[PDB]
Structure formats: C-alpha cells, structure tokens
Amino acid sequence: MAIDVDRTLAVLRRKLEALGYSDPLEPASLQLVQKLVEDLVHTTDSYTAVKQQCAKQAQEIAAFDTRL
C-alpha cells in the first residue's frame, strides 16, 4: 500500500524530470493529476474504513472490561 504510493511518487518524479509533461493542459499531464487525485480518494476511503474497524474493535475491548 505504501509500496504503491512509493511507486506512484517514483513514476511522478520521473515524469516531472522527464520532458513532455511541462504542458499542464497536455492530456498526459491532466491524467497524471487526475490519477493522483483518485489515488488520494481511494487512500482516504481505506483510511476511513480502517478507522471504523479500529473503532469497532475498541468497542469490543471495552465490552470485556464491563464483564469484569
């Protein structure tokens, strides 16, 4: 997961130092920006879900404390 982000940064960094991505209205440039946005959305979704998992587990843990 962090490996995927790492790769994304690697590809991005190549593109920036590489030529042909200097024109932000070039389709390749706009889709590069679009990919990053979508990556952030998916990652933000996953973060939200795992926050729920953690929250449910905290509830299960606190449920034991009361049983004793």
Place this chain on the structure above:
Amino acid sequence: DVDRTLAVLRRKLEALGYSDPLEPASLQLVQKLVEDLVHTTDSYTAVKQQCAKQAQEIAAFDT
C-alpha cells in the same frame, strides 16, 4: 469556454516574456496532493497497526 480563455491568456503572457502561468499552479496542486496522499497513507498505516494490536488483545480475552 474556459480552455480558450487560458490559451489566450497564455499567448499574451508569452509576448510579455512570462512563462506559462498554469504550470506553476499545476505544480502547487501536485505538491499538495503528494503531501495529502503521503500523510493519509501514514495515518492509514498507523491505524492499520493499531488494529493488529487490538486484534491480539481481543484474541487474548477470548482464550
């Protein structure tokens, strides 16, 4: 359309000796996206680890 307004504005700025104004703006956007992407990924990983711990703690309560 907005695309033509920017193209016109681009041309008039090249004439005045100014580089494409969209490029700097685009770079800043990417800067913020990268930062958010990494920050959110760190938090994700951190919570993901907290779940593992809690999972063990829950496994111990059972047995």
